[PDB]
């Protein structure tokens, strides 16, 4: 078990900015902390790094203490926005992190071939863009086969081909068996590459689990577009007698609204019959879940399209 | 060791600072220029009090140009929060920065007073090479210590502030206070009281300014005139020997480095 | 030209002593016999404006209380008021009033003459080029000139090659030169006061003489000018407010901005306890005049204290006691009278102004103000100047202001 | 129409950095210029402003030349990564832009409420977050009655509620006749609100049109995520022989890349053969359509885990 | 007019600069402390005040306006401001009015408290000569500051980064205050056979710090050429700044 946070009520100034979460983490899963930019997310990310002390709580990273030197060799962190050393070179900064984490100096060349930076190595870091510094900032985090990544928005300022390819590099590390924690704020876009999500706000942890676990717990409407169907008949209105609201769209298509606890039965209601013929489902996404968990406790939605 | 692995960065980062290499070549072309003007006129106690005054203006300047953005320049640059998640302590990335920036000042004054020796042994014919090597060996291993004081001053004023634009304001304030304000407050205290404030306390007030302890070390053997000393003529009234004056310069490092570590430990 | 016996002298005492009554007289007069003639205060012996009015050729003549008026003006034939021949030894000229356009007292080749307590008002309209001398002395040994009042003559007390004589307490007002000295070896002068004069004291080529206690109030362009004086003694002189101006002729000196003391080729002399006050230049030391004992003076209020256009160092302190300087910003820790740091009165930029006058346009620049501070930090660029170790902290001339 | 770019060719030296672009933005639509960070997008974004001049063509912003003062009074703009004058206040900075754009002073306190900056107004600009300054830079772009907006990267550093609330403001604006332009790089999150995208490569303009027209032009597959199957490899071996690149995401989850003539016939083999706990069908997104058109003109795809 | 709407920004932004208010307080402290030591210990003290305001009024002007153009380009607001109804001239001239009235006020706290320390510590100073010799001093000290203000707009528009603007503003401050007159002395004391000293009253007109002192020392040229040569240093360098700002 990679990160076993168990019973941590972290306070400072007797304010309880992080109160009583029990967050596990698997050996290969890719967790996403999706809190606000306040007391929830960035406090809890510091305790896994061990640079913050857990007031009344045990944080057992990798089954060991969070501040041992034997576990910070097997850990990789990338902060939210870094401008490293604007007079140094590309290779030299990464060579400077090579001797610090204790990885071998042969690894510093293949990482700059791994991340597409060998065309821009041996150049001063003040000539790099914001994307290249994120490309460099990822490359230090992968130094010396890290068993726990910790990325805080690793996708900002980067080209969309590269961000798509970055999750492929994350997927190489998941199958290799490294638990990764993402801390993002661009939430539509990171939901296709996580296995679990931990949404926390107002200090406490609100909910946790996979995406299918959160949709099952939080009753949200779905969109089931089903074109190419039967006779535009009682097959349409039978879900209104089953407890739904079938929109009788014109060109032999229905958009049924369900409650998603009755989800898989409505699929085999049509797919068990002979007329699905290129249907399309539209689930509630991550932000529509993320809007909902604030409405369990916390803020209320805006007015006249403000904020 | 981890202290040398982070010293090797700052040794390779300070030498790419173009503002350093301007005023470290300025220290070299002035130490030749002072020693060349001191060679055509001869005298010996004027070329010591002017070289020690040259390193009073520049060795605090190179030290404060190096290390004003050592901690706060890494904090707002984001690379300090990353560095604490490496197998290090807060005591190793400060002592490592002190070794890394300290070897630059040990090389910036070995260039300066090294070429000053070659502008005397190749200029003053028949000079005593034994007295030259000893006097400029005392200049080399004491202008580093003056440099290491203001290096350790800059770690104090970088950990306390939290914005780099305000760190340059404090580093300019420390350079003005210790070099040419404390020498003028002590002058104005002696003139306006006409030397009758305290006949025993006022020479001990030189020890609260490391540039004045630096000038008192190099002007030990070559006293000569009094007007070359000026406010440093109080140093003849100090009953302390010369060996404690080395130790009072080293105590200005260790107090202002342990203060630099105690501020950085609760950053 | 009649004689003194051709008047009507009423004898008071029978020891060849006469007394002329009140009443005017006319023409020149000549003393050829040792007559100690006195005069009533209304005895205005007024000549007509030609010739030397009262010539004396006999020894031991005590002329007293006369009042002379309007003698000649021929400076080539020496139209004096009282001419004294070399054979007229030990003449006493006591308490006399003179008004006329020539020489007041022209003596030459005489010995031990005493010209005491007289008031000699020279002229008012002549351009100070033909007014004649106040007290002219030409190669006299033994003279004693005391407490006179010479006003508006030409070049004051002229003295030419006269060896042993005292000049005590004489007031000299609105003349060209105050006291002129020409080759007067082993002289002496005490407590004289010169006011509003185009040169206060001309000391030209006269050695071994004593200049003591003299005062020069508001003179023009030269307070005490010493040319080629050796083994002298300048003790207690008070030179105040030498303003600029010009003598109008520029014959032996030039026009100046105002120098309280100008030392030209004077090798050995002791210049102690003086007071040089509120002039433009406190002391001008030429390059040929070096190594003399200058200690104990007070250089107060001058806009520039020392002018020394040289590169030779010049210590200004005998026996460890120096001078009081008003702009001496020093302290005194060990409670003696002396300051603790030495005082350099001149920078390097204070001698660029003397060498090149076009830098006066640059004299208010910050770079010049930078260059004044760089000398105080780097003494290698300090040219060897006119410093004095241990300058005084208090005024040493506490009595000279009275 | 709002922006009618008729064949411009902007060039710096002799290199044509924008070769025969031809846009036509309608007056009620929301458009997105998606391109890489080189000379494709950011030269074209300045030609709609008055900052450059077309070396071969002409633009017509609102039927006028783009440098008239009466044009720029109804044209907001928001650049990427703007930090304002840090010693000023939040209110006074907006009041400074109020007098410059000619908007009345009563509209300043409305827009400070409209972006949710009223609690943090009348404070220093230097004590603002990155997301807080982006609220301010939006708040100046709505000044007056802006008939054209150029929101270059509007949602960097914002909260995911605030990101979701910003496009709520946008959808009120495009119904008010005020056509806007997005220039983002985060492709999911803008794809729900782009009315017609204008994806272009480094050199030229590749393809424009709606999301329906792009998926009709580009025959992209669909993604079928089946969450909660029994075994992984027995299902993973079934589709890789059937001609479907299938991966594994967690302990029980797969994805299937269909051809949409396969999507109907494969989906029955999940509910029928086996029982998944959840089924999610993704349409080919803007993130995947970007990969197509970059492969149509630009580089080759990167190797398996590199960028 | 929009030249004033952007000038009200620079008043509010310049007066909250912590670096400016530190130097402007130190300028007012050093202006009384020179006036304290010139009365207790008027042409003798207005020349020493001229050496003070030649040190600091270029330094005050270069602290205000070294980041006027390139500080807005790095902040991204310069690219935003050009999309407003604004020419490039009205931004520059509006910054010159806004930054100009700051050091036109910094001499009114600088010499407004220095003339207070003279008119209330002499008691019989004859203020009719004071208010014309200080009226000529406060006018000529702001116009000297407007030269280095216009110099800072030339140097801000040329560079592309904020670090090299301050590296050049220190270079402009060294050259025009205390290197040009030191290289005037080196042409005097080391060259006399090939340096005509009659040419030297014309070379003071190539330096606005030198033209500043010549209108506090009243001289072969009259007064009216020096006022028209100080305004020509503003008007050429502002026209040069407008010519550089149109080439970004
Ligand atoms: Mg003493």
Swiss-Prot record, chains A, D:
Explain the induction of this protein.
Induced in response to denitrifying conditions. Activation requires NosR and DnrD regulators.
Membrane topology, as annotated = Peripheral membrane protein
Mention any Pfam family matching this sequence.
ABC_tran
Domain of life of the source: Bacteria
Q: Which UniProt keywords apply?
A: ATP-binding, Cell inner membrane, Cell membrane, Hydrolase, Membrane, Nucleotide-binding, Transport
Mind telling me which SUPFAM superfamilies this protein's record contains? P-loop containing nucleoside triphosphate hydrolases (SSF52540)
> In its keyword annotation, does this UniProt entry include Membrane?
yes
Binding residues annotated for ATP, in chain numbering: 35-42
Please summarize the record's notes on activators and inhibitors of this protein: Inhibited by AMP-PNP. Partially inhibited by N-ethylmaleimide, orthovanadate and NaN(3).
Q: Where does this polypeptide localize? A: Cell inner membrane
Principal subcellular localization: membrane
Q: Which residues form the ABC transporter domain?
A: 3-227
GO terms under cellular component: plasma membrane
Report the pH sensitivity of activity.
Optimum pH is 8.0-8.5.
Family listed: Belongs to the ABC transporter superfamily.
What does the record give as the function of this protein?
Answer: Required for the assembly of the copper chromophores of nitrous oxide reductase. Has ATPase activity. Could be part of the ABC transporter complex NosDFY.
Q: What is this protein called?
A: Probable ABC transporter ATP-binding protein NosF
Organism whose genome encodes this protein: Stutzerimonas stutzeri
Swiss-Prot record, chain C:
User: One Pfam family from the UniProt entry?
Assistant: NosD
Keywords, ordered alphabetically: Periplasm, Repeat, Signal
Q: Does the keyword Signal apply?
A: yes
Q: What induces it?
A: Induced in response to denitrifying conditions. Activation requires NosR and DnrD regulators.
Q: Repeats (PbH1): which ranges?
A: 58-86, 88-109, 110-139, 140-161, 162-183, 206-228, 266-287, 289-327
- Keyword Repeat present in the record's keywords: the answer is yes
Any one annotated GO CC term: periplasmic space
Record text on subunit structure and interactions: The complex may be composed of an ATP-binding protein (NosF), a transmembrane protein (NosY) and a solute-binding protein (NosD).
The name of this protein is Probable ABC transporter binding protein NosD
The record lists the organism as Stutzerimonas stutzeri
- Please name the gene that encodes this protein: nosD
Swiss-Prot record, chain E:
Induction behaviour: Induced in response to denitrifying conditions. Activation requires NosR and DnrD regulators.
Location in or out of the cell = Cell inner membrane
Q: Where are the transmembrane segments?
A: 19-39, 46-66, 102-122, 137-157, 170-190, 225-245
Organism placement in taxonomy: Bacteria, Pseudomonadati, Pseudomonadota, Gammaproteobacteria, Pseudomonadales
Described function = Required for the assembly of the copper chromophores of nitrous oxide reductase. Could be part of the ABC transporter complex NosDFY.
How does this chain sit within the bilayer? Multi-pass membrane protein
Top-rank lineage group of the source organism: Bacteria
| Designated name of the protein | Probable ABC transporter permease protein NosY
| UniProt xrefs under PANTHER family | ABC TRANSPORTER PERMEASE (PTHR43471), ABC TRANSPORTER PERMEASE PROTEIN NOSY-RELATED (PTHR43471:SF1)
Please provide, alphabetically and separated by semicolons, the GO molecular function terms listed in this UniProt record.
ABC-type transporter activity
What keyword terms does UniProt attach to this protein?
Cell inner membrane, Cell membrane, Membrane, Transmembrane, Transmembrane helix, Transport
Cell membrane as UniProt keyword: yes
The record's Gene Ontology cellular component field reads: plasma membrane
Note the subunit structure: The complex may be composed of an ATP-binding protein (NosF), a transmembrane protein (NosY) and a solute-binding protein (NosD).
Matches recorded under Pfam families: ABC2_membrane_2
């Amino acid at each position: 078990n990679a990160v076993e946070i168990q019973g941590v009520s972290q306070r400072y100034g007797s304010m309880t900015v992080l109160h009583d979460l029990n967050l596990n983490l698997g050996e290969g899963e890719v967790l996403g902390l999706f809190g606000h930019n306040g007391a929830g997310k960035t406090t809890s990310m510091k305790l896994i790094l061990g640079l913050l002390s857990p007031s009344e709580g045990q944080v057992k990273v990798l089954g060991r203490a969070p501040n041992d030197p034997q576990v910070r060799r097997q850990l990789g962190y990338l902060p939210e926005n870094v401008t490293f050393y604007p007079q140094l070179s590309g290779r030299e900064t990464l060579r400077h992190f090579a001797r610090l984490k204790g990885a071998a100096l042969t690894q510093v060349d293949e990482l700059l071939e791994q991340v597409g930076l060998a065309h821009a190595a041996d150049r001063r870091v003040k000539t790099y863009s914001k994307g290249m510094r994120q490309r460099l900032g990822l490359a230090q985090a992968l130094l010396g086969e890290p068993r726990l990544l910790l990325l805080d928005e690793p996708t900002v300022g980067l080209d969309p081909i590269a961000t798509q390819d970055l999750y492929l590099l994350i997927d190489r590390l998941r199958q290799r068996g490294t638990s990764i924690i993402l801390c993002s704020h661009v939430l539509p876009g990171v939901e296709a590459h996580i296995n679990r999500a931990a949404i926390l706000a107002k200090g406490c942890l609100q909910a946790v689990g996979s995406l299918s676990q959160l949709r099952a717990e939080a009753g949200l409407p779905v969109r089931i577009r089903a074109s190419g169907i039967s006779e535009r008949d009682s097959w349409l209105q039978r879900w209104t007698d089953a407890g739904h609201s079938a929109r009788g769209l014109s060109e032999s298509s229905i958009e049924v609204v369900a409650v998603n606890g009755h989800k898989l039965v409505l699929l085999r209601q049509l797919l068990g019959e002979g007329e699905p013929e290129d249907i399309e489902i539209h689930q509630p996404s991550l932000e529509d879940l993320y809007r909902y968990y604030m409405e369990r406790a916390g803020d209320v939605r805006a007015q006249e399209g403000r904020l | 060791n981890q202290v040398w692995n982070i010293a090797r960065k700052e040794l390779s980062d300070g030498l790419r600072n173009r503002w350093l290499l301007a005023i470290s070549l300025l220290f070299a072309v002035l130490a030749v220029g002072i020693a060349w003007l001191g060679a055509a006129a001869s005298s010996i106690p004027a070329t010591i009090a002017s070289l020690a005054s040259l390193a009073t203006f520049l060795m605090p300047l190179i030290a404060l140009l190096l290390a004003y953005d050592a901690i706060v320049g890494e904090d707002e640059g984001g690379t300090l929060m990353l560095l604490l998640t490496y197998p290090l302590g807060r005591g190793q990335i400060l002592l490592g920065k002190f070794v890394g920036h300290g070897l630059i000042l040990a090389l910036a004054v070995l260039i300066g007073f090294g070429c000053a020796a070659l502008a005397i042994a190749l200029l003053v014919e028949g000079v005593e090479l034994g007295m030259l090597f000893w006097a400029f060996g005392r200049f080399m291993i004491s202008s580093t210590l003056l440099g290491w004081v203001f290096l350790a001053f800059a770690y104090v004023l970088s950990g306390k502030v939290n914005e780099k634009s305000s760190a340059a304001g404090l580093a300019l304030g420390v350079w003005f206070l210790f070099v040419l304000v404390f020498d003028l407050v002590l002058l104005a205290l002696l003139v306006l009281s006409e030397g009758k404030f305290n006949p025993e306390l006022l020479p001990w007030l030189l020890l609260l300014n490391p540039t004045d302890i630096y000038r008192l070390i190099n002007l030990s053997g070559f006293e000569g005139s009094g007007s070359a000393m000026g406010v440093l003529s109080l140093g003849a009234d100090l009953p302390v020997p010369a060996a404690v004056l080395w130790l009072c310069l080293l105590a200005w490092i260790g107090v202002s480095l342990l203060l630099a570590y105690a501020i950085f430990r609760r950053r | 030209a009649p004689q003194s016996i051709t008047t009507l002298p009423l004898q008071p005492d029978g020891e060849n002593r006469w007394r002329l009554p009140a009443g005017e007289y006319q023409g020149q007069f000549t003393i050829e016999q040792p007559m100690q003639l006195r005069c009533e205060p209304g005895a205005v012996i007024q000549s007509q404006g030609q010739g030397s009015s009262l010539l004396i050729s006999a020894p031991d003549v005590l002329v007293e209380g006369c009042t002379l008026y309007e003698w000649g003006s021929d400076l080539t034939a020496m139209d004096s008021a009282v001419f004294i021949l070399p054979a007229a030894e030990r003449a006493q000229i006591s308490n006399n009033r003179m008004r006329g356009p020539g020489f007041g007292v022209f003596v030459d080749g005489t010995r031990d003459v005493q010209v005491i307590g007289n008031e000699i008002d020279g002229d008012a309209g002549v351009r100070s080029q033909d007014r004649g001398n106040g007290i002219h002395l030409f190669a006299v040994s033994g003279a004693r000139v005391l407490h006179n009042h010479v006003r508006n003559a030409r070049d004051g007390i002229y003295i030419d090659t006269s060896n042993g004589n005292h000049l005590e307490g004489n007031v000299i007002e609105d003349v060209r030169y105050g006291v002129h000295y020409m080759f007067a070896n082993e002289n002496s002068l005490i407590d004289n006061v010169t006011r509003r004069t185009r040169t206060g004291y001309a000391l030209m080529q006269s050695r071994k003489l004593t200049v003591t206690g003299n005062r020069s109030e508001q003179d023009q362009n030269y307070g005490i000018l010493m040319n080629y004086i050796t083994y002298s003694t300048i003790t207690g002189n008070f030179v105040s407010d030498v303003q600029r101006g010009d003598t109008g002729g520029d014959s032996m000196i030039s026009g100046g901005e105002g120098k309280a003391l100008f030392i030209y080729n004077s090798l050995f002399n002791t210049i102690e306890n003086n007071h040089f006050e509120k002039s433009s230049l406190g002391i001008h030391l030429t390059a040929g005049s070096e190594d003399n004992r200058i200690s104990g003076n007070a250089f107060v209020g001058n806009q520039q204290q020392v002018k020394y256009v040289a590169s030779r160092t010049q210590e200004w302190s005998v026996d460890g006691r120096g001078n009081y300087w008003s702009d001496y910003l020093g302290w005194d820790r060990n409670n003696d009278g002396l300051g603790d740091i030495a005082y350099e009165p001149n920078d390097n930029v204070d001698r660029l102004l003397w060498l090149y006058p076009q830098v006066r346009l640059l004299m208010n620049s910050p770079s010049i103000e930078v260059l004044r501070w760089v000398q105080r930090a780097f003494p290698v660029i300090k040219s060897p100047g006119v410093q004095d170790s241990h300058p005084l902290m208090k005024l040493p001339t506490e009595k000279l202001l009275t």
